[PDB]
Each structure stands twice: as C-alpha cells, then as structure tokens.
Write a protein that binds this ligand. Structure first.
Ligand SMILES: O=[N+]([O-])c1ccc(O)cc1
Lengths: 182, 179
C-alpha cells in the first residue's frame, strides 16, 4: 500500500538501508516476515519501491523522459510525470525533506549522488539539443539545468502542501516553457 | 554563535507549538538560563518571532514591495531574484520525516503564510490582466501556482548548496514565464 511505504521511508530515512533490519520492518509494519515478502518482496525490493514513491531524481523515469526528441519535450514529460507521482503526499520528496533544518548519512550520500546525476543527465540532454538544434545556440545550459531542478523540487513542495492536481499539471506545463524549442 | 540556539528553539516550537512551550522548556532545551535567553533573544514571543523569521520561506514584506512594480513580469522578476539574494533551509512543507508531527499551531501558521503569499500574487495578476499587461486568456490561478513552485524550488536548490550565480540566473529564467 501507501502507509506501509511511508512507514518504510521513516525507517530508512533515520537508519539508512544497511542498518534497517527485516525485524525493524516487520515490527514497524505490524505484519510477519512471510507476509512482508509476499506484499513487498525482499528488503531491497521494498527499499527500491520506497525510492520510487519519494525520490524526485529517480533514474528510470528521468532517462525515460530524456528520450523525447527535443529538450523542451524531454523536460515537459519529466515535469508532468513528476506531478503525477507527487500527487497529496505531505513530506515532499526526499531532497525537499533533506533541505529542512533537522537523514542518515547513507541517505545523504544517496541524495547527493542522485541530485548530481540528475543535473548531469539534464545537461547531457541540453548538449545533444544544441547539436540537434532544438536548443538555441548560446543557451546558458548550466543555468537552465539549475532552473529545471528548482522547478521539480518546487512542484514537489506545492504537491506536498495539497495543491490541486490539474492546477499543478498546468504549472508544470508553464514551467517547461522555459526550455525553448527553436 | 547561536544560530544553533534558534535551530533548537525551532525544533521545540515545531513539536509543542508556542502556547504550550514555557521558558523552562526552552532553557532546558537550549541549555541556557532565562536571563541569558532574555539578553540574546527577548521574551518567549520575541524568540518565537525570531525563530520564525529565520525559517519561514514566505517573506511577505518583500513580496508586497515587489508587487508595486508596474508590470506583472517585473513584480515576479524582482520578487524571485530578490528572494535568491536572501537565500545566498526554510520550512517549505508542513511535515517532517525526522521531526515528527508539527503542532497544529505550526501547521495553521505555515498554511496561512502560504495562502497569503498565493493570494498576493494572484491579486497582482488579476490586477495586471485588467490593466492590460497579462494577455486575456492567461490562467492566473495556474500562473500563481507556478510562481509559488519557482520560489520554493529555488529555496530548496539554495538549501542544497547550489552556487549563487546559477540561482540568480535560474530566477531570471523562472520570471520569463510571466508574459
Ligand atoms: O556546484 N555545483 O554545481 C553544485 C553545488 C551544489 C549542489 O548541491 C549542486 C550543484
């Protein structure tokens, strides 16, 4: 379910992956080890499902978005897809959470890596778009990557605060407009 | 310093809220005696206001000042760039993985501030749509939601360590969607 993933998130957030036991998860979830396995799989399966739910910078979805034929469509796809994932979840995504005053160091390391891989993946997309010519020459790619990152996290914050989904989707469509299509 | 004292104060207020927090709670959490608390921060009220001013993303006074610019675009532009000028980690959300449940006092306060900010931008847009600078058809509701996302996202980027010059450039880009 959905409270189950939140429960798993809090544990992994505080303890990290390595230091979270099956026994921690069964106790927190209130189900036995075979039922945890039947519902969520191995601890690793459960951890990857938790990251699907709470990570802005999820690799597979970013990569799937980058395959679109223009940088604009790539970013558009990505931003609207995130809005689907983000929508009522009150914590925001994990980077939003890590940015608050007062995560386990393993989780800090994970977010730090994921954020920079996202930035670089977007920059690689921008580099290809300049060669293909759908990004105008002289585009500040570094600035534009940072803006895309700001847009994702900002849409996460709005979702977390309870913004209506059609309104947030309209906002993501406006945000994508900043990535030009020449 | 005691940038950190205010961090610890914020943690206690987040949990207990204002009314149920005593000086005796604060002194035992900050590890400092009340005269010291009075010298450094003032009354419980002053300390509360100080801690809120440190950690709230919504800066209404500087927002309202930005709105007095004659175009919707210029208003947003000066608000966004101005916001980055301050940033260089606020309570962007009303829930904490680590911190536990926020007191209902804190939830209400954060909700009101968010809503004030949104209304202020939405008004300015509605003003601008009549005054002529926003094209009729413009979705002012979606456009205000976008501005909120930009301001909080730039806030998250800044909190995560983004370089100043990149963030300023990102703000200027973000202002471009207000026609
Ligand atoms: O310097 N950079 O390019 C950065 C710095 C910090 C950060 O969180 C992301 C990117």
């Amino acid at each position: 379910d959905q409270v189950a993933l939140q429960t798993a998130m809090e544990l992994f957030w505080r303890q990290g992956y390595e230091g979270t036991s099956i026994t921690d998860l069964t106790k927190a979830l209130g189900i036995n080890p075979p039922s945890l396995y039947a519902a969520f799989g191995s601890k690793r399966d459960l951890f990857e499902k938790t990251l699907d739910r709470y990570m802005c910078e999820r690799t597979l979805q970013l990569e799937e978005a980058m395959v679109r034929p223009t940088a604009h469509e790539a970013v558009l796809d990505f931003l609207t897809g995130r809005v689907e994932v983000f929508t009522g979840q009150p914590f925001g995504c994990m980077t939003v959470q890590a940015g608050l005053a007062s995560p386990h160091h393993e989780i800090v390391d994970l977010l730090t890596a994921a954020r920079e891989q996202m930035r670089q993946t977007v920059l690689d997309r921008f580099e290809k778009a300049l060669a293909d010519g759908d990004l105008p020459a002289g585009t500040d790619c570094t600035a534009l990557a940072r803006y895309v990152m700001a847009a994702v996290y900002g849409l996460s914050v709005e979702a977390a605060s309870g913004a209506p989904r059609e309104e947030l989707t309209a906002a993501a469509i406006l945000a994508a407009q900043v990535v030009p299509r020449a």
